[PDB]
Amino acid sequence: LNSSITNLSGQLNSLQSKVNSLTPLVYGGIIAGIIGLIVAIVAIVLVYRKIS
Amino acid sequence: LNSSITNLSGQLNSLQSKVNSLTPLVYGGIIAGIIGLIVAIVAIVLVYRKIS
């Protein structure tokens, strides 16, 4: 049982490590999709005002 | 073995808050990035359309 729990705590620790190595990666990654949305939007706007 | 179980549960609960604050936010980030990509691709065509 003891071996079972030790390895188990171990896997949790480990998956928190995947998610916390992921933490700055997924934030930067959100931050690139959101600037993409806004920079795309401000460029469409500026082309759309002069075609219309 | 008891104290280790209570700590496992604690750490699990922490990490479940973490990933449940991730999964919507990361979806929203991904939604914003694909939409930004739509807007940008449609901007490409409209600058291409208006020079022609």
Residue numbers in the entry:
A (entry chain X), B (entry chain B): 424 to 475
Can you list sentences taken from the study reporting this PDB entry?
Surface layers (S-layers) are resilient two-dimensional protein lattices that encapsulate many bacteria and most archaea. In archaea, S-layers usually form the only structural component of the cell wall and thus act as the final frontier between the cell and its environment. Sulfolobus acidocaldarius is a hyperthermophilic and acidophilic Crenarchaeon and thrives in acidic thermal soils and hot springs worldwide. The Sulfolobales S-layer lattice stands out from others because it is a two-component lattice, consisting of the S-layer-forming SlaA and the membrane anchor SlaB.
By combining SPA and STA with structural predictions, we built a complete S. acidocaldarius S-layer model. In the assembled lattice, SlaB trimers occupy alternating triangular pores around each hexagonal pore. The SlaB trimer has a tripod-like structure, with its long axis perpendicular to the planes formed by the membrane and SlaA. Three Ig-like domains branch away from the trimer’s symmetry axis and face the SlaA canopy, whereas three α-helices form a coiled coil, which at the predicted transmembrane region insert into the resolved exosome membrane. The lattice is a ~35-nm-thick macromolecular assembly, in which each SlaB trimer interacts with three SlaA dimers. The new data confirm the overall p3 S-layer lattice symmetry, in which the unit cell contains one SlaB trimer and three SlaA dimers (SlaB3/3SlaA2). Because each SlaB monomer interacts with the dimerisation domains of SlaA dimers, the SlaB trimer occupancy of all triangular pores would likely be unfavourable due to steric hindrance.
